[PDB]
Amino acid sequence: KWDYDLRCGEYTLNLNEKTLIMGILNVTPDSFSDGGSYNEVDAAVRHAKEMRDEGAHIIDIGGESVSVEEEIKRVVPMIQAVSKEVKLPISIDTYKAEVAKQAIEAGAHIINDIWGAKAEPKIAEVAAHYDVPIILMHNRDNMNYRNLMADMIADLYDSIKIAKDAGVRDENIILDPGIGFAKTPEQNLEAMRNLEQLNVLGYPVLLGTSRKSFIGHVLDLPVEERLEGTGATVCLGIEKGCEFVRVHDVKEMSRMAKMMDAMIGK
Amino acid sequence: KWDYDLRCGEYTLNLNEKTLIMGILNVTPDSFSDGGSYNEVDAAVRHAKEMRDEGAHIIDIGGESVSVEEEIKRVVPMIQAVSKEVKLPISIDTYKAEVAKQAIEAGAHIINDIWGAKAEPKIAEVAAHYDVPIILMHNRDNMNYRNLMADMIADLYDSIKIAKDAGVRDENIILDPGIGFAKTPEQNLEAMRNLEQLNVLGYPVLLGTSRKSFIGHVLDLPVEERLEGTGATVCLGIEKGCEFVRVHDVKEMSRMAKMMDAMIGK
Ligand SMILES: Nc1nc2ncc(COP(=O)(O)OP(=O)(O)O)nc2c(=O)[nH]1
Ligand SMILES: Nc1nc2ncc(COP(=O)(O)OP(=O)(O)O)nc2c(=O)[nH]1
Known part of the structure; x- marks a missing residue:
């Protein structure tokens, strides 16, 4: 069914x-530090290690949940430590071109952009240069849809044209519906x-619904x-x-994914 | 979409x-007793109560997981206690006509037959008389299928004709694919x-896959x-x-069912 694999440097x-599991890294920052300190990075590494043991195929790493130069000092040490100590592709959760660039120099393999190259189009240029997969998430600054799905797909296409115009290859494009962004619960x-x-x-x-508020709204x-x-x-x-x-x-989702896969015949 | 409700006496x-949740009752029998004793029935009642609090809509009660007269002395006291103390429809997990009869006299509302009226056709006569819903599960004494699904549906039809010939109304018929019966893991x-x-x-x-061995085989x-x-x-x-x-x-499945329902629009 897919006639290529997702090339990610050494992985x-x-x-x-x-179904590939992307594990969301804990990145509790130390008050009292710029980034790099031992307690933050060690807890980050130990968590990556846990997730790798529990069935994760990608570790996703963020710097904000804040100042671009600040965000880089937080996230770079983490990428460096995790990438040396955990044999798994790392994605960098940023919409900023400079952050994406340093993150990849630091060892990151995949860009994860919640603004789908619309916040900082140069991020696609970065992606094109290092020849890395980029996730283009659906997102916008409003919930005024005429037809939700039609508009998401349109909006996603606008992200794809930006990625492609900057030289991104189809094989490096992943889409994400951006559940929990610019959307009412319904x-x-x-x-x-x-x-x-x-x-x-x-x-x-890629689908990202983990613990999000729309589950809370239902349950x-x-x-x-x-x-x-x-x-x-x-x-x-x-x-x-x-x-x-x-x-x-x-651990839990890995198991549910694995059973779904067997059922649907993947 | 369904143009009738499932009538179950007072419920x-x-x-x-x-999605309606049928909760499987624990029925650990006391060594040292015929049935009716306080420890078995109390643990059965306390469990029914738990499941009712956790979101169950039906309590399903068995007498074997063994002698028809034995099976009735185990299950009747349980149905009597649970039906008085827990305001929920009870189904009786039996393929035996006499067991089904006493279970309903005892307070049971729905028949649950893992042999789909093929082990004891008179069970359909019982169902027809008390005018109760009956679950016809797919089952057979072999795994020699030509086309699994085609044959299950055929086999299910054979159960339906037996139910109908004995006077069972369409509105009282529920089907069940019998996952984990007469089937290889694949x-x-x-x-x-x-x-x-x-x-x-x-x-x-109705679908019954809970903890069954084919999940073990996959995971x-x-x-x-x-x-x-x-x-x-x-x-x-x-x-x-x-x-x-x-x-x-x-508790857990109730929550997953509830979220699925909201997603699929039930
Ligand atoms: N590609 C992608 N990236 C994402 N980044 C953040 C969040 C939501 O972030 P938040 O709820 O702040 O925390 P967490 O990152 O733990 O979900 N969701 C996505 C997503 O759905 N897809
Ligand atoms: N209608 C219906 N009845 C059933 N009764 C027993 C079991 C399997 O029984 P067992 O695994 O012995 O124990 P438990 O009853 O806890 O599943 N499965 C079904 C089922 O899938 N559908």
Whole structure:
């Protein structure tokens, strides 16, 4: 079904054997430090290691959940430590070109842009240069949709044209519906319900619903009681053709993904 | 979508608002007793109560996991205690006509037959008389299929004709693919993968995959580590149109069902 693999420097991800699990890295920053200090980076490394043992195929690393020069000093040491100590592709969760650049020099393999190259188009130029996969997430500054899905796909196309114009190859493009961004709770559900529509664009899709507020809205449960809700969204995502899921609870979701895969015949 | 409700005596189950959760009752029998004793029945009642609090809509009660007169002395006291103390429809997990009869006299509302009225055709006569819903599960004494799904549906039809010939009304018929019965691990997965085919028969479908061995075969995990695997099967079942799921882990599955429902628009 996918006639290429996702090339990631020293690592290679097959898109046909299994749903790939992207594990969300904890990055609790030390008050009292610029970045680089031992407690932050060690806890970050130990967590990456956990997730690798629990079935993660990618470790996703952020610098904000804030000043570009600040964000780089936080995230660079983490990428360096994790990439040396954990044999797994790292994605860098940024929408900033300079952050993406340093993150890749530091060892990051994949760019993860929640603004789909619309916040900082040069990020696509960075991606094109280092020849790395980039995730283009659906996002916008408003919820004024005429037709949710039609508009998401349009909006996603606008991200693709920016990526391609800057030289990004189709094989390095991943799409993401951006669940939990620029969407009402009911719109998030509608997108989940129609996620298979994204497949017509011809690119691998990553789904990120982990613990997000729309699960809370449905279940009336707080962030730490959302594991069954998240699992449902992962399952439905995989039945609808997603190639990756981005999740906090790697052990649990790994298992649900693995059972879904066997059922749907991936 | 369903133009009737499932009538169950004093209780009424809507088939359109939500996936209905059937909770599997613990029925650890006392060595040293015929049935009726306080420790068995109390633990059974306390468990029914738990499941009711965790989101169950039906309590399913068995007498074997053994002598018909023996099976009745175990199960009758349980039905009597649970039905008085827990305001929920009870189904009786038996393929024996006499057991089904006493269970209903004792307070049971729904018959649950893992042999789909083929082991004891008179069970359909019982069902017809008390005018109660009966679950006809797919089952057979061999795994020699020509075409798994085609044959299951055929086999299910043979159960329906027996139910109808004995006077059972369409509205009281529920079907169940019998996952984990007369099926190799790979056949169980194939059935999951094609469960929506059962919908053409026009009856509500109950799915029972809880902790079953085919999840173990996929995940290489023992019975008590199968919650994420079960959840996956429930999710995929609900996406494929199931009206009920029969589960041990009522709290967790209730939540996954509830999130699936919101996503698929039930
Ligand atoms: N590609 C992609 N990246 C993302 N980054 C952040 C969040 C949400 O961030 P937040 O809820 O602040 O924390 P966490 O990163 O733990 O989800 N969601 C996505 C997503 O769905 N897709
Ligand atoms: N309608 C229906 N009834 C059933 N009864 C027993 C079991 C399997 O029984 P077992 O694994 O012995 O124990 P448990 O009853 O806890 O599943 N599965 C079904 C099922 O899938 N559907």
